[PDB]
Amino acid sequence: DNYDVKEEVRRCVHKTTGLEFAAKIINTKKLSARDFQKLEREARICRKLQHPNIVRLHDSIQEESFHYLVFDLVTGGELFEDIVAREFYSEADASHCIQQILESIAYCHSNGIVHRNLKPENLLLASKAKGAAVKLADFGLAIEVNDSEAWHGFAGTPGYLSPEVLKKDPYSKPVDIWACGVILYILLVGYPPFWDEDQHRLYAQIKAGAYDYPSPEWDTVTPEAKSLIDSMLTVNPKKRITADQALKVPWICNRE
């Protein structure tokens, strides 16, 4: 009885504090029954995650046949778009962009959540400002886990997927740091590290750890930056850098 609907999920504004929001509105009995019970799980998760770089869920409300989920409102569009936009980040803007995603990931992990579906098309910008914040979204594939590696199903976007998941090995948190390296890799040059036309040709290249730094583009990227990628695109999970560790690197610890 507080929120007032606007255009379109769809916007809305609190009656008291008048702060714009985004309200996802689901249906009964569409979505079906246990289709709904998949959103049960999913929604619980976003409610554990209250962090500036995570599209925070603020309230969950059951009406009659419709369900309401009040989310942070983000407008700068997808990070994907901003990347095709500018072609590729500078190391500075890149350092900044990745440090934001890292802090969000870090928080997720230090809270038992693994994203899995971490990609550019799932990172939203506050605005297209020259400093705007980045927000994490889409927890459809998110799962809650202990420090113990298992085989938590097989899902994620083909291209960002981790070796350990293609080898049907047990995996945990570091599947996300792998995705980062892919992203951070893209930011610096605007093409992917692993890619082929044939899906299997691809997974092969991934599993293999097959990526390089083609000249001349990479010829002029600070080694400190490559090294940070190298350590995210470490094929052996056990030794692939963690989030809280990546946040302590020079090439990220340089606000000046």
Binding site: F80, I83, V84, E87, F88, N117, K119, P120, E121, L141, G153, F154, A155, G156, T157, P158, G159, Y160, L161, I186, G190, Y191, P192, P193, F194, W195, D196, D212, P214
Partner: peptide, 16 residues
């Protein structure tokens, strides 16, 4: 090597 720029390639897919 090279692969197409992220603009040219398009936007993900997802897998289950």
């Amino acid at each position: 090597k090279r692969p197409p720029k992220l603009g040219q390639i398009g936007r993900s897919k997802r897998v289950v």
